[PDB]
Amino acid sequence: NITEEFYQSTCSAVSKGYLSALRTGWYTSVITIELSNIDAKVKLIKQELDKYKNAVTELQLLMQSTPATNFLGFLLGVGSAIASGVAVCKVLHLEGEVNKIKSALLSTNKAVVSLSNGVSVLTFKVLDLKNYIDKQLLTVIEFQQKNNRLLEITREFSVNAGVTTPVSTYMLTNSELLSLINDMPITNDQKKLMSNNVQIVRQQSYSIMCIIKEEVLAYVVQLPLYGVIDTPCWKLHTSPLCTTNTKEGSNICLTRTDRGWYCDNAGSVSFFPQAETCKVQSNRVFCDTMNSLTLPSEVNLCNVDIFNPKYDCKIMTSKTDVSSSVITSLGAIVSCYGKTKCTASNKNRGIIKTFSNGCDYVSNKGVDTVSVGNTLYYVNKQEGKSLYVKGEPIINFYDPLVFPSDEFDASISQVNEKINQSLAFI
Amino acid sequence: NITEEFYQSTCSAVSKGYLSALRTGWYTSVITIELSNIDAKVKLIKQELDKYKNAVTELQLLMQSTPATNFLGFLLGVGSAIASGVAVCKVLHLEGEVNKIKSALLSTNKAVVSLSNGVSVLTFKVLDLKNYIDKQLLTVIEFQQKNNRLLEITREFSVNAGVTTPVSTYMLTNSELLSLINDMPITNDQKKLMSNNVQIVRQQSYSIMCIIKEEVLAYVVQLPLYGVIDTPCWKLHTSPLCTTNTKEGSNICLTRTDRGWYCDNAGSVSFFPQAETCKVQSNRVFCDTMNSLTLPSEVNLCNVDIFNPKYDCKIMTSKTDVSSSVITSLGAIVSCYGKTKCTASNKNRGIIKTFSNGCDYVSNKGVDTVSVGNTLYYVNKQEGKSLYVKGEPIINFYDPLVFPSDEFDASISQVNEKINQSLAFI
Amino acid sequence: NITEEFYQSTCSAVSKGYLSALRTGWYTSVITIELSNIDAKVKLIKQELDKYKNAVTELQLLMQSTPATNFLGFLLGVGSAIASGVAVCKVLHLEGEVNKIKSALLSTNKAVVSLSNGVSVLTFKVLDLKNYIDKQLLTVIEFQQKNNRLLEITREFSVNAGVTTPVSTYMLTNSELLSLINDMPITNDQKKLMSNNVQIVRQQSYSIMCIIKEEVLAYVVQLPLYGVIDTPCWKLHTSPLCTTNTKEGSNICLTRTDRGWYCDNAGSVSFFPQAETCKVQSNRVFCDTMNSLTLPSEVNLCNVDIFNPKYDCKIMTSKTDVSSSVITSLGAIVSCYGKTKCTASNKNRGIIKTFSNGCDYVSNKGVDTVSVGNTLYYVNKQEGKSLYVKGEPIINFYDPLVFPSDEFDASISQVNEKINQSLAFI
Numbered sequence A, B, C: 001n002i003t004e005e006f007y008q009s010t011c012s013a014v015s016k017g018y019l020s021a022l023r024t025g026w027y028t029s030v031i032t033i034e035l036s037n038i039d040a041k042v043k044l045i046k047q048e049l050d051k052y053k054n055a056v057t058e059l060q061l062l063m064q065s066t067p068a069t070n071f072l073g074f075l076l077g078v079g080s081a082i083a084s085g086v087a088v089c090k091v092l093h094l095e096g097e098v099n100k101i102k103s104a105l106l107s108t109n110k111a112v113v114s115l116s117n118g119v120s121v122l123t124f125k126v127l128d129l130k131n132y133i134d135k136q137l138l139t140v141i142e143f144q145q146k147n148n149r150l151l152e153i154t155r156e157f158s159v160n161a162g163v164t165t166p167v168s169t170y171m172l173t174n175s176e177l178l179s180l181i182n183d184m185p186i187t188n189d190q191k192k193l194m195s196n197n198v199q200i201v202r203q204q205s206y207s208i209m210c211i212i213k214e215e216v217l218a219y220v221v222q223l224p225l226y227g228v229i230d231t232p233c234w235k236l237h238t239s240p241l242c243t244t245n246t247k248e249g250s251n252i253c254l255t256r257t258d259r260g261w262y263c264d265n266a267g268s269v270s271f272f273p274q275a276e277t278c279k280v281q282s283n284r285v286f287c288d289t290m291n292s293l294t295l296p297s298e299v300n301l302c303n304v305d306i307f308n309p310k311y312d313c314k315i316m317t318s319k320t321d322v323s324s325s326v327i328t329s330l331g332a333i334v335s336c337y338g339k340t341k342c343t344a345s346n347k348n349r350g351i352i353k354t355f356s357n358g359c360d361y362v363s364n365k366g367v368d369t370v371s372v373g374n375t376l377y378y379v380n381k382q383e384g385k386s387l388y389v390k391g392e393p394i395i396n397f398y399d400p401l402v403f404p405s406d407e408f409d410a411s412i413s414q415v416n417e418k419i420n421q422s423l424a425f426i
């Protein structure tokens, strides 16, 4: 299942055996709520009724403007996360366009409405207060329960300038969301995947407050499309590889900057430089293509042979040999340099390995924690097999007198080109 | 209204036609809540009463210490976001200083109190529980409704170490906030602007828990002053401009780093390097001067002539010709390089343009989405006119043999100085 | 108590007199909730009962997977913030392991349970709904109050993919938390420190939803261990030090990059490059060692003598002489360059100092605000003594013709090595 290799030569590690679920597109749905325009038992409902009016009044000043959004991570492009959503929203403001929906959801709560600009959208009426108020109201406990949802949606939108994420159970109750997934124009694989991970789907969704007109409240829910499912993913962990000379400051370092999540995708490889745009559930990785780069499948060759002629593996250089650790999926990389105390420990047994200077690695099998300096790291105790791939630390292949000691957006070939240049001049 | 130019020569775009609203100062207000010190129907109120006591008790251990706060974005200074607020808070701890406020808000809920260090502050009593408990309490539903606000403010402060933002309707109800804006010593223009955008104002405000002494709870609300309104703003979007040679890795790139929000301000131009410190509502940009740089109005000359002699336009260089896109206000910039598939599409019609290698641009007029590699971007469908300004890609003016391929905090003149130096040596 | 020195020579300032509280380890505790498996007065409880069932049902699809987590800040390592917690969680899934806890908390609510892998954990039953429902239920107001907590924990976990922080009073009520701290295997110093700062402890804790099996709900609370208390801490503030020549762009700059929080720790000094991983309460600094570097105590020598031979003080260079300010603990650093207007002001008196070009500093004593360009900074009005340490701005010691104008990850010796190299070639 989940496995991991460590490369002693490049001070990196790859965790493989993951299955993609990349948000690729968006599905927009219009959620609605129909509204009403209007002793001791009475006075308490008069208070609960003004709560209603206040919520509505508050939702109205909220919509005096169209809703807002305006290592190698810096290489990414720039999106408009909710452009699709808002695009749908601006259409609901058109006259009659509201009345089509008010009409469509008359005998049912869940209908598909074709809109005037050709977007076919799944509409949903999740709360009919008009029906409740105009009849049942025109018991103090009954009303408070029905009204409470309305007020809470109002709180979320008011403190979020009218765009919320993750999408809450107020915006879309669990049962409403699951059923919304079912009636959705997608595959049986997406339907199951989404349904088995509704808490994730929520995190990847947007609730955009839209309009209050003609006794109707509308807000667009922006839901993820996972066009890429069950393709291989692997996570690349890198740590700094430095020399270990005695005199501190005479050392040269080197770090692979191409770390992140990597997934096979449509011939190429989707690269996620910020591995917090990805959420791992067991062996499934949920990613967002908005936060990715599209690289050749040859990018994977840097792992095994960082000197390969097919892809120019990206690194960075420095003379800053500080100690740290990276806690991988199935173990720990340790960069021990200078006078730092770095160890690995078991729970009850205590210290079971003292790391020598340079980049080393230990697997979580038998290890519970890792210490580098004053920093205690707990390792992930997830089940899986590690493979330590012994090799000569490539930092040893460079002569320190002609080693460029402050490159960030660099690569193996760019370093050799700067060495070849400085070598010539000598 | 909103318009946009694309510069084919510098691979950038400027969206103009926006109106400033920059937070420049802060207004502090002291919000108060007066407190009380003390079968089946009874037992439920005994539970609701201990909820009260627990909230108070919790608010008390919370205040055993003074409240806490201690591309070109890295160039910004560093503020103390709530220094003004806390400055006011430390004054309320002085003896008698509480009793002045308890006194002032005796016959009214909204009074201005001059404090001992010369700060004149608008005080506000938004909930008189003392009055309710000592009289009405010393019905089970009535008490729960009145008490509930107190508990919720207590939740917000307890999970936020006593400083909340955005400011909630619990901290300051909509009606309380609007009326607080009205009695505020500001212009008619600020009052209207603030009131039309209370959800934004909330996002730009702070609620700082302050003190519980002498039957009084106090917390300072820190509200934005918009000293700059209705001055021109424009947003600069940049993308990487690379050469497009066949052999991958023989290409040189170049990106304008001076991207962000730009606003006219008091002779100079306020620059916002992190365009997420700015919130756009329709055509109004709300910004924070805390997150800005003060640049000459001559900074705008980089757009039209990046080679102008009046301002040294800031760029960065690399050899990393990866493909991406930037979704502008009224369109999309596309940096297509190497073997990447980049297209633009309409909704129902499909693909309507295939981008060739190099930096190009397309407007949202007729386009719904843009694709660069495995990444689908939706364009903003906001209404407005785009202008494509044809020009020769300046990256072509540089000889690759003497082009500095890893500059970040650089400029046009710094690159020429490094070229002039390396040229001489040859 | 709290004091501060400014170094005119290096354009930096150090605020000293703080007391450490560094999270070093984690304490895991298993919180439980025991569950039940099953006219006008009746119908409302039938609604409150399905709320129960819905919450439970929702908590169940939430746990179809193991919970998720997968200037000089870039030098830090990488942790697995909740690895310890999840490590404990995966154990509760083992058969019988639940039934041990269900058993242990039969006659009490707070017991220590040894688990099958040798971890001794403090278990806690904070809500016995099984007892309430199977007896009292098998009044409409009573049930709603008891049930409400359950629903709210369910909301927190559902919108957070099952991992929450800060830990709320729903997850662990104030009284439950304090008492959990008391029965904890730690010192009298940690117990008092933790208890006096429960709002902070909450911010530094994790609530990880774990399991629903055998009428039991379990979630692990991950609580901080403060192994380092009451050791000296100091905060280093740096600002750019540039020359002040007339012709703009002929100036060279220099900034100390080693800014952050610094604390004495076990022979070495814990360095916190991102001073927002640290929370200051009065004179106590709460830090996380996960976000730190372990440096020699000789790092403090850069303050007084940045040219000292014991530690290679870290700086960065540029030619970007933009004006800004840094608001220190007891004052303000001002970097005024070019045509910028920089001043310092009192509240009622107005402007009391106009800053000349170059890096200067003013103390909060008598000053309320500082202005640099269009940016108004309020200074922290915290009480304490400042010391201005006059010295020659070291940027004057460098010849601009051979000054490396774009170094980031550099140091005093690396700059001299690049100068010595370029000097030789001339």
Ligand SMILES: Cc1ccc(CCCO)c(NCc2ccc3nc(NCCCN4CCOCC4)n(Cc4nc(C)ccc4O)c3c2)c1
Pocket (backbone or CB within 6 Å): A074, A406, A407, A408, A409, B074, B406, B407, B408, B409, C071, C072, C074, C406, C407, C408, C409
């Ligand atoms: C210059 C500068 C200013 C601010 C930041 C971010 C501040 C952290 O919050 C950074 N990034 C962190 C960071 C950490 C180590 C870095 N090392 C470098 N290389 C120095 C560039 C100069 N080159 C050319 C001249 O001769 C010396 C080497 N850069 C510059 C650099 N940086 C990026 C992201 C892309 C391309 C690039 O050449 C670094 C940036 C860099």
